[PDB]
Amino acid sequence: SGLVKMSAPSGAVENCIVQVTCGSMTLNGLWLDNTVWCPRHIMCPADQLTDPNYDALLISKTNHSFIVQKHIGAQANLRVVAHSMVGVLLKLTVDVANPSTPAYTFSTVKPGASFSVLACYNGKPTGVFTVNLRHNSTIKGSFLCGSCGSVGYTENGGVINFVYMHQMELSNGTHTGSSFDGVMYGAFEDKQTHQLQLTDKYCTINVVAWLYAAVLNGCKWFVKPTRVGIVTYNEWALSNQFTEFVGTQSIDMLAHRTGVSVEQMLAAIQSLHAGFQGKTILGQSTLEDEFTPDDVNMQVMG
Amino acid sequence: SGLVKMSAPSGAVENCIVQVTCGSMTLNGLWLDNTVWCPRHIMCPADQLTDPNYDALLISKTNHSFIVQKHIGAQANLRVVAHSMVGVLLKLTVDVANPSTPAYTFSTVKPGASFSVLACYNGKPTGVFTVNLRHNSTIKGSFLCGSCGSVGYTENGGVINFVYMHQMELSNGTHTGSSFDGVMYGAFEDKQTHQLQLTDKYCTINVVAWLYAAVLNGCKWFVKPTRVGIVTYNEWALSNQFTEFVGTQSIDMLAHRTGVSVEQMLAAIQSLHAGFQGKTILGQSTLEDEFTPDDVNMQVMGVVMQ
Numbered sequence: 001s002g003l004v005k006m007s008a009p010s011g012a013v014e015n016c017i018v019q020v021t022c023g024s025m026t027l028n029g030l031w032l033d034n035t036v037w038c039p040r041h042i043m044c045p046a047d048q049l050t051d052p053n054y055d056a057l058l059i060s061k062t063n064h065s066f067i068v069q070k071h072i073g074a075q076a077n078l079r080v081v082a083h084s085m086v087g088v089l090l091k092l093t094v095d096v097a098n099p100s101t102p103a104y105t106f107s108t109v110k111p112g113a114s115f116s117v118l119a120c121y122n123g124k125p126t127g128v129f130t131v132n133l134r135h136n137s138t139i140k141g142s143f144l145c146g147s148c149g150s151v152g153y154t155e156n157g158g159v160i161n162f163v164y165m166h167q168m169e170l171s172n173g174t175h176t177g178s179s180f181d182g183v184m185y186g187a188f189e190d191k192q193t194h195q196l197q198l199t200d201k202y203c204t205i206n207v208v209a210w211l212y213a214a215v216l217n218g219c220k221w222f223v224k225p226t227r228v229g230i231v232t233y234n235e236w237a238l239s240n241q242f243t244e245f246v247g248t249q250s251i252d253m254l255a256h257r258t259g260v261s262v263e264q265m266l267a268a269i270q271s272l273h274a275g276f277q278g279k280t281i282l283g284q285s286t287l288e289d290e291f292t293p294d295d296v297n298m299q300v301m302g
Numbered sequence: 303s304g305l306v307k308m309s310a311p312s313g314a315v316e317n318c319i320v321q322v323t324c325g326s327m328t329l330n331g332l333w334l335d336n337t338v339w340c341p342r343h344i345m346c347p348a349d350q351l352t353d354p355n356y357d358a359l360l361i362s363k364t365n366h367s368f369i370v371q372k373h374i375g376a377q378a379n380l381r382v383v384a385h386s387m388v389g390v391l392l393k394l395t396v397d398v399a400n401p402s403t404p405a406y407t408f409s410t411v412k413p414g415a416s417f418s419v420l421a422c423y424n425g426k427p428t429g430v431f432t433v434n435l436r437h438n439s440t441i442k443g444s445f446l447c448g449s450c451g452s453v454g455y456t457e458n459g460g461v462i463n464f465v466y467m468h469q470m471e472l473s474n475g476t477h478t479g480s481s482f483d484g485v486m487y488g489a490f491e492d493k494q495t496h497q498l499q500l501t502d503k504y505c506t507i508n509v510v511a512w513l514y515a516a517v518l519n520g521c522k523w524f525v526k527p528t529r530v531g532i533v534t535y536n537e538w539a540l541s542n543q544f545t546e547f548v549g550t551q552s553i554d555m556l557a558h559r560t561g562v563s564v565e566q567m568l569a570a571i572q573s574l575h576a577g578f579q580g581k582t583i584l585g586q587s588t589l590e591d592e593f594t595p596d597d598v599n600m601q602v603m604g605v606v607m608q
């Protein structure tokens with residue numbers, strides 16, 4: 001029992017981290033097969049980040065403009081033999097295939113989904129943590145200068161699913177990056193110009209999963225016979241900055257296991273959103289919306 | 303910027319996880335050089351866990367009673383060449399040295415210290431998370447049956463400090479294990495009997511570190527000219543289930559960086575313990591005491607003018 005923020009073991013990803021240097025700019029890259037991915041802003045000189053012309057910057061580079069170094073484990077300098085730009089990423093080709101390339105896929109996560117982050121500095125992994133893609137397609141992480149190229153991923157059935165490459169900080173504790181197709185989450189542009197973040201929302205399905213985890217951890221004071229239908233809740237959600245509830249097998253499994261209906265959990269959300277009134281749930285006095293139903297299922301049974 | 307629960311990268315520890323089998327019992331083990339460590343309850347039959355006689359169980363075993371296998375990564379089937387019991391652990395000597403043994407040491411963490419946990423099941427690493435050793439020497443983790451032998455560790459300056467090997471669940475979301483000297487954190491016995499956990503306390507120094515992280519993340523509404531001296535605060539702490547505040551360089555660095563004194567943070571704790579007055583600190587309405595001053599410095603400290 002117990003519920004904590006759990007990340008996927010990072011070893012298979014640590015074996016793919018490299019350092020990429022272009023001029024005086026150094027950041028992290030991901031080495032899979034003969035490819036090294038890194039943010040394209042490595043090409044910018046430090047005083048020209050406001051509105052870079054990436055097409056003009058790309059043409060000024062040759063394969064020799066990029067230096068790639070594996071800093072952890074068997075240390076090595078990898079020779080860059082080709083380079084192209086894919087959205088907000090650089091796709092470098094190196095002459096050596098990564099011998100520790102794991103079985104992997106590239107996916108783009110949807111808002112409300114969770115993933116693990118391997119924070120890296122100077123091609124060196126330094127920390128692991130989990131985030132949730134917010135309703136406004138940002139993440140609430142912990143990153144400092146030199147963390148770009150840090151990697152977000154999930155793992156299942158021996159396959160690493162690479163979903164994020166860190167790019168920028170939008171505002172205090174708010175971050176964004178791109179998927180490996182080079183598309184920035186939230187369509188933010190890789191330029192240091194003010195861009196508006198859309199309003200965030202509480203992810204209902206994740207709050208429901210968390211209240212089920214609370215019931216499965218002996219915390220059930222908030223469960224009442226009171227029920228609120230999905231369509232009624234969804235109408236209330238549109239006016240109270242909560243996402244629409246859409247049913248899933250994972251939630252049905254928790255509902256069947258606890259004997260508490262989804263409609264009872266939706267009524268509890270409406271009651272708890274008005275206030276906890278001096279009470280806690282799993283040590284918290286605010287609703288937690290970053291555990292998905294699958295994250296909760298993982299920590300209650302196999 | 304931002305502050306999250308961060309664990310140390312687990313790859314160096316994942317390379318040391320093995321599965322140990324004794325009879326019909328299987329659990330996780332840690333392989334370092336020619337040694338494999340695992341919980342001694344692997345020697346118990348599944349229906350005799352209430353009060354095992356480990357001395358009697360040990361004498362019935364030979365080196366051949368233990369099967370050690372490595373499934374993940376560089377696979378192996380190891381041969382046990384000696385065995386002994388060290389507190390609540392079995393120490394198995396194997397004929398092959400782990401070729402991926404990292405630079406390491408064994409340490410016992412004190413209450414209020416944080417560490418990373420690599421949760422494992424059947425010799426497979428499955429999750430990573432961070433915990434804090436509570437004032438009552440328990441941890442608030444997330445573990446299910448088959449997780450014993452999961453490993454707690456920290457990393458600093460290229461060295462893995464191995465500090466915990468998971469053993470048991472005491473009550474809902476409350477866990478314990480042993481350090482690698484075989485001493486159970488909190489002196490709990492590896493038997494399935496009711497055992498009283500001592501009362502827990504809020505770790506003051508960690509709450510102070512967190513309020514400094516909040517100030518460094520633009521949240522400073524709780525900072526007032528009001529001060530509480532350490533001696534006065536420590537007298538109040540003895541009566542309100544808070545630990546004694548003892549000054550440290552790490553806290554002084556945060557106090558110097560923010561220009562907010564420790565005594566202002568101790569006043570803020572006393573005010574916030576009575577209630578948050580409908581406001582939040584880093585999205586929370588309760589005090590957070592599981593980030594140490596070094597954990598905060600890692601995520602918030604930068605360049606310093608001298």
Ligand SMILES: *[C@@H](CC(=O)OCC)[C@H](C[C@@H]1CCNC1=O)NC(=O)[C@H](Cc1ccccc1)NC(=O)[C@H](COC(C)(C)C)NC(=O)OCc1ccccc1
Pocket residue numbers: 025026027028041042044049050052143144145146147148149167168169170171175188189190191192193194195196197303
């Ligand atoms: C990673 C860069 C790196 O590794 O540099 C070494 C070569 C770094 C990560 C952030 C710094 C602090 N925390 C981070 O997560 N990324 C950057 O610094 C970005 C670099 C860059 C991006 C695009 C073009 C050129 C360079 N820039 C930012 O993150 C920048 C930070 O500014 C502050 C003031 C918010 C900290 N963000 C920015 O300018 O955002 C503009 C914006 C967009 C949307 C909403 C609001 C503002």
Ligand code: NI
Pocket residue numbers: 447448
């Ligand atoms: Ni069991």
Ligand code: NI
Pocket residue numbers: 329341343448449450451
């Ligand atoms: Ni066990």
